[PDB]
Amino acid sequence: ANANLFVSAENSQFDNYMSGPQVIEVVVIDSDINDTDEAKGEPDVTVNGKVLRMVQAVDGNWYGYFADRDQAQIADSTATTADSGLDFGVFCASSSGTAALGFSTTETDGIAIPITIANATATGNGTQTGSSSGGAITTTCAANTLDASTANGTINVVREAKDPVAASGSVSVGQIGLKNGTANSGPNWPFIQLYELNPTGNVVVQYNKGGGVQSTTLTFDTVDQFAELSLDRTVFPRVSQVHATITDLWLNIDPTDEDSWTFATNTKNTTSSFNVDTFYQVFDENGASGGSALTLRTTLSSLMCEDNCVLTLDVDAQSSGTPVVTIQDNGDSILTQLNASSNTNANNASAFGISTETAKLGTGSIPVTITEQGPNSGVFGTYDESDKSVLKITDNAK
Amino acid sequence: ANANLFVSAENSQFDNYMSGPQVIEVVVIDSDINDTDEAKGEPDVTVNGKVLRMVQAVDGNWYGYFADRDQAQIADSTATTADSGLDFGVFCASSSGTAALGFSTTETDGIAIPITIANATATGNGTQTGSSSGGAITTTCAANTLDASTANGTINVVREAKDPVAASGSVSVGQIGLKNGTANSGPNWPFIQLYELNPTGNVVVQYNKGGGVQSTTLTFDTVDQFAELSLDRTVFPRVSQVHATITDLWLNIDPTDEDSWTFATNTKNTTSSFNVDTFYQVFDENGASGGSALTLRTTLSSLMCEDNCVLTLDVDAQSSGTPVVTIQDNGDSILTQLNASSNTNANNASAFGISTETAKLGTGSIPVTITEQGPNSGVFGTYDESDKSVLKITDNAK
Amino acid sequence: ANANLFVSAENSQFDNYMSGPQVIEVVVIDSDINDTDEAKGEPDVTVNGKVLRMVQAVDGNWYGYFADRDQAQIADSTATTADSGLDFGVFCASSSGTAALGFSTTETDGIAIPITIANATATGNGTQTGSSSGGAITTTCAANTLDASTANGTINVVREAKDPVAASGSVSVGQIGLKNGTANSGPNWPFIQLYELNPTGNVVVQYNKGGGVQSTTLTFDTVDQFAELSLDRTVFPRVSQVHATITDLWLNI
């Protein structure tokens, strides 16, 4: 971890790899610049030789968030409703930094700010939804863009951001000049700086201080070689909990929060309209709503998924008539028995669904939810904090 | 971690275990941020990867208090009168931090603030008493909640809290922005941050500073394997003091104060209404009132008690007619002879009780009091500082 | 000596014993609370589990003075003229702390303040001379008791007390609120907090700070097993000086 520079992707287990639409947090912790009532200089931090702008927070630490340009654009196109699924907010040009954030972002490929567009002009006001293909960002953003915004805090890929240091005396907001410093509900903080990165190539983060430089190198590549599923036991008795653990680097989109994913896994739903699918943040880590369910099935190829973003389940493998596995509510999801008829019971996995999202996660199409065991771990599970799994063996199983 | 990070549960004797509704103090002592007239940055402290908010105190040290969500709720339900027994005060939602404390508490499961509710609305004003079962906390708290409070300082689980640093120049109250900094009699300090923890699972406390991180790991599990009672001698002469020492991790609820417990121990009181019971802080460590007596007998199963929260006594084991053991007042209790008739004497253990609490601790039902030998020791005794035990051998014993 | 807590009776030679009408000084020396222009919190100090109130002084140190209740009362009865012999001044009830000193002294058995009584009422004005037998102190003291006093500084058992820190800005007198901070000639500083202690029983002094607690234990008993006389020589010639040394814990009041 060096001494004073911390980068989220620095994990020995996964060999410093990063992949997909993920955001990366860079933190500087140093006692030379830790004060918040004096105007100390911004620390000098670069990624692949290009400047990373760092905001001071109330803990006396300097933060910056970056992501690959094309992956942010491609992922943002899935988020059809604002502040739900993988929303990076609105895509602005590099020149827009001075007019929108209040400081220069010119050595970046683009910036993602959490506002909404009221006046959808062709030129002066950025792109709300992003491009399914990606490319260069050319639409600019201005000061009148911020004021006209009707819903602030539309970024959903970073949800747990520290408060920017306040404006007192010589000190500006975030000590570098943010125009509005209300974190995770304001129009400026957090924001993601976009960089064009080379697949299968190294990414280098540097901090230049007196007496030497700290570096951290990361790899940008598909990470299906670090992905696996583990079950707690070999043989399962009749009313056991099925405790499934998924480890996948790709699934940790938020570096500050606990990431939640929801799957339609029924591989024997044969309705023509139905497809196995993946959804992002349909729930919280505390089993709240946390937003709508938005399709990701046809975009997983373009987000660097190599056979590693899909969960499928078969409740009755031998078609004996008695289903082995059922599903149940727990502390990290809101599952409901939609067929409450006396003729069926809790062993019918196809009688459960999600009430708010019935088009794609209704009756049948067994919804399965996983939650991140730690903000930036990359290890997911179906268990909750009371040890109640989503997947349970049926009472009449053979 | 024993360089700059101190956690209360760090005890080699008990193998870093914690259990029950007990509160845990985190202290940071470092010379880099020890000043109180400059606005240094809050130290970055996390439990199971979630942020712990730290207040600076007048000694230049940073404090934070946490507890398990369900255990705080279950214990708080026993406290039927305010600021007596195990009161955590009032349960607020995570979002309420900004409106109530004046700073963000969003990476917590809930907060416990020491006020009382005047206007008991369904939504905008939190829960006074807590749930006997526990669960998610959803009721919010607002700024108008604090002002309408008619009795501040209702938390009874933390009683010895250091003064928050005052607002001078660039420095805010507690250097992080508490709205009212009067300790142990104000509406904000101390407060407990609630976390959902895994029974039989590890709890990790981390501090991130320049040059490396300090960690401390704790276990959250039932602790009856560390509990025992010892007597001073094997054979007791006629007017001896019976000096009993109890060691139990579970009994140390307050990490800053000296914990006092009172027991109804008469196992031959056969009155239908009577039950052996346990009470919390019926006295102080200086033998003052310190609050009312509130039942805990039917809730001990839900507070992780495994055969280790109950004291029983039999004064005459062989039923010879002469009772071997009696009870007497000392410096850490207020015991009174309720039957003052000349026909009885000081050898009648059933003629003593507590005057203020006669329903459950009256005549008969031998009350026995223990006091903690040190703020955060976990070793209790019946002796006081003058060496006068509560339990004494009768003068006419055979 | 621990690190930051100093108690007078802490002497290895006498095995931490204390006896008789003696006053005990508790001092806290720490660099965390040594400033005198900021309102730092009073350090948390207890004796036998009861709170000891600590005044800050100009050296940035916190002071408190305590004694056994019955021994102070019995010794005070010998002092027939004021500010002579073993005078603890005037005995007030615990409730009187707020009205006399300006801060709460309710977890004490009694307080001894250095004034004189002008109007010797039965109730509202305390006891000048003390009881030869001792017992519970029940006479109270009020604010009008201080103002009517005609001779301040009548305590003779503590004579060398550091100056209470002055009232500037947010800081009160002695940083805890003394009503008159002129040391050894005023009506409030020093004052002795009285505690009921058990002969042949331990006395425990504790200080609670972040990162651990300091304790000191003392014994309250007769101390004639540590008392002796020594002469400088064995044989003395005709116009010699006889240099006699007495060591006795009891004699250090």
Q: Which other chains touch chain B, taking contact as 3+ CB pairs less than 8 Å apart?
A: A, C
Contact A4 B210 (CB under 8 A): yes
Token pair belonging to A325: 């596995």
Residues of C in contact with B57 (CB under 8 A): 41, 210
Total CB pairs under 8 A between chain B and C: 86
Contact B61 C210 (CB under 8 A): yes
Q: Which residue of B176, B196, B211 is in closest CB contact with A385?
A: B196
Best mutation target among B98, B196, B214, B302 (most A Cβ atoms within 10 Å) is: B196
Contact B285 C49 (CB under 8 A): yes
- Residue A343: C-alpha distances to residues A275, B254, C15 (Å): 28, 53, 84
DSSP B172: P
Q: Which of A89, A105, A12 is nearest to A52 (CA)?
A: A105
Residue B41's closest chain A neighbor by CA? A60
Q: Which residue of A6, A35, A375 is in closest CB contact with B39?
A: A35
Residues of B in contact with A3 (CB under 8 A): 210-212
What CA–CA distance (Å, rounded) separates A386 from A397? 24
Q: How far is B252 from chain A (nearest CA, A)?
A: 24
Q: Which residue of B6, B288, B371 is in closest CB contact with C210?
A: B6
Residues of A in contact with B39 (CB under 8 A): 35-37, 168
Best mutation target among A25, A26, A34, A38 (most B Cβ atoms within 10 Å) is: A34
The b/e string for B196-229 (b: 16+ C-beta within 10 A; e otherwise) is: bbbbeeebebbbbbbeeebebebbbbbbbebbee
3-state secondary structure of B231: strand
Q: How far is B34 from chain C (nearest CA, A)?
A: 8
Q: Which other chains touch chain A, taking contact as 3+ CB pairs less than 8 Å apart?
A: B
Q: Which H or E element spans position B97?
A: helix B97-100
Residues of C in contact with B285 (CB under 8 A): 46, 49
The arrangement of strands across the sheet holding B212-220 comes to B17-18, B212-220, B201-209, B44-47, B50-52
Method used experimentally: cryo-EM
Q: Which H or E element spans position B261?
A: strand B260-264
What CA–CA distance (Å, rounded) separates B333 from B390? 9
Contact A313, A368 (CB under 8 A): yes
Contact A34 B39 (CB under 8 A): no
Contact B42 A59 (CB under 8 A): yes
Residues of B in contact with A169 (CB under 8 A): 170
Q: Which residue of C38, C201, C206 is in closest CB contact with B37?
A: C38
Q: Which H or E element spans position C69?
A: helix C69-76
Token pair belonging to C118: 């002008």
Enumerate residues 6+ apart whose C-beta is below 8 A from A264.
A274, A275, A276, A277, A279, A360, A361, A365, A366, A367
Q: Is C103 exposed, middle or buried (0-12, 13-18, 19+ CB in 10 A)?
A: middle
Q: Which residues pair with C209 in a beta bridge?
A: C212
Contact B33 A34 (CB under 8 A): yes
Q: How far is B277 from chain A (nearest CA, A)?
A: 29
Contact B332, B273 (CB under 8 A): no
Contact C49, B165 (CB under 8 A): no
Encoded amino acid at A339, one letter: N
What CA–CA distance (Å, rounded) separates C60 from C49? 25
Q: Which H or E element spans position A72?
A: helix A69-76
What CA–CA distance (Å, rounded) separates A319 from A322? 8
Q: Which residue of B29, B160, B385 is in closest CB contact with C201?
A: B385
